[PDB]
Symmetry: C2
Subunit: 280 residues, 2 copies
């Protein structure tokens, strides 16, 4: 009743939750290792993708990256036709929409997925692509995680994933950076935890407060000043250097502030720096 | 020890502290503000009188350069005083100023204020305090007029430190939100549409921070739930998305540089949290 390709982390993590509900579940892996275990719970494992595709209409692609998709599926392109391929990736929007057209030109349906959680979260997922083909396999997808359809463009699901990861990676390194500064001044990562937690948990309040102003392209400085902002970032950079810690991350922050100041935003809200990000 | 206090520095923060003290029965002398006089404060015309008025002096200044400008010409009269510096400068400037004050005979306490002026006089609020234990305990009660107190230790720099590293995270994290929003908007998705996802992502960080804390704390970075190598590839995807949107790449490429130094140093198979050694220059010779 479903097929999983890419018996890696999420791969098995998905295949497990499928056999736990009663679908004829086939499987297959790139390196072509046997990965026996799940074969003992209702899983056929074909000797090529030719059959693993002709097994069911639904197919879930959990590959390392999109390049690997073309490699294994090109041999069987004559059988992609009439299938619905759910492509769960971590790649850029352009790669997703390149992939979707490739699959559409073989006669297949497609859904682009952006998984929001580690395989342990097998909880929401981004989905984009043709509306009708998503609604038709909605229930089946809701087994893996919650579904959050974002629209028609096959790249929307990748895009939403990527801007989450933008924030996650940058905020998490600032936490590692802040922890390096803390340790060099003699406070442990364990003592710092509640303070790093409150800061990160306080950010939604600021986002909710600024969003409507950002939405309107307005940056009044009634509650904060870019200038005070900048002075404050300068204190962070000097704190870091005095502690003997690498300064490249906070310096990158200071540079965005500096550009805002020189574009005349000193009296505006620091949120005006989004204009600097839009290369104004 | 009567209920009297001096507040030097009368910007939004000093005015609130002074009002909090007035409302709690202190005779309050000030120097920099018509409003606080109408409420019972006494203005000292000069720094010398301000300092002579009381043992306990509260400083709310822009930073420590401001402290020397106004305290230097009155170096005498600093003797048996207890100065509380409630300014937000670096730890090293707080250690310097503590030693400068003690050399003129003044006890000292550093504070880092975690709230806007209007959170002063609410028990919900806290302030970092650091410096010699006994002088802080002898003034604990008075300082709780303004906020709760979180004494952090002897090192006079610790209050400023805790403030600065929460700034480190706040500004870096907020800019990544602005950066992410720009990328969203450039792909036609509004900041209101993005809002829920931006808030969830920031909301879920305490969970990741809690998970990694005992490993980081023990200097251990095993690769059992994440790999640096996979992380750099994810950062790479982010930069490519950012540039396809026409959005400035400064912020995410700085992030990528850190991952690069980590890979270069043989940590491909460690957790990405081993990047904290990169930040400590463990790879750079001492």
């Amino acid at each position: 009743s479903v097929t999983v390709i890419g018996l890696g982390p999420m791969g098995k993590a998905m295949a497990a939750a499928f056999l736990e509900h009663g679908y004829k579940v086939t499987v297959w892996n790139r390196t072509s290792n046997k990965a026996d275990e799940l074969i003992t719970k209702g899983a056929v494992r074909a000797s090529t993708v030719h059959e693993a595709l002709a097994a069911n209409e639904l197919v879930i692609l959990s590959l390392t990256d999109y390049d690997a998709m073309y490699t294994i599926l090109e041999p069987a392109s004559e059988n992609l036709s009439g299938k619905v391929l759910v492509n769960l990736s971590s790649d850029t929007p352009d790669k997703a929409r390149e992939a979707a057209k490739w699959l559409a030109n073989r006669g297949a349906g497609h859904i682009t997925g952006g998984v929001q959680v580690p395989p342990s979260g097998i909880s929401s997922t981004y989905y984009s692509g043709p509306k009708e083909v998503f609604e038709a396999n909605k229930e089946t997808l809701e087994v893996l995680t919650g579904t959050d359809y974002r629209g028609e463009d096959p790249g929307l699901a990748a895009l939403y994933y990527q801007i989450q990861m933008d924030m996650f990676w940058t905020a998490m390194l600032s936490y590692l950076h802040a922890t390096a500064v803390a340790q060099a001044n003699g406070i442990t990562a364990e003592q710092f935890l509640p303070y790093a937690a409150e800061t990160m948990s306080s950010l939604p309040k600021f986002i909710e407060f600024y969003t409507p102003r950002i939405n309107a392209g307005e940056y009044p400085g009634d509650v904060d000043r870019l200038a005070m902002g900048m002075a404050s970032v300068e204190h962070v950079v000097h704190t870091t250097q005095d502690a003997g810690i690498d300064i490249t991350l906070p310096t990158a922050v200071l540079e965005v502030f500096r550009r805002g100041m020189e574009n005349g935003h000193a009296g505006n809200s620091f949120t005006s720096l989004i204009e600097i990000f839009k290369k104004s």
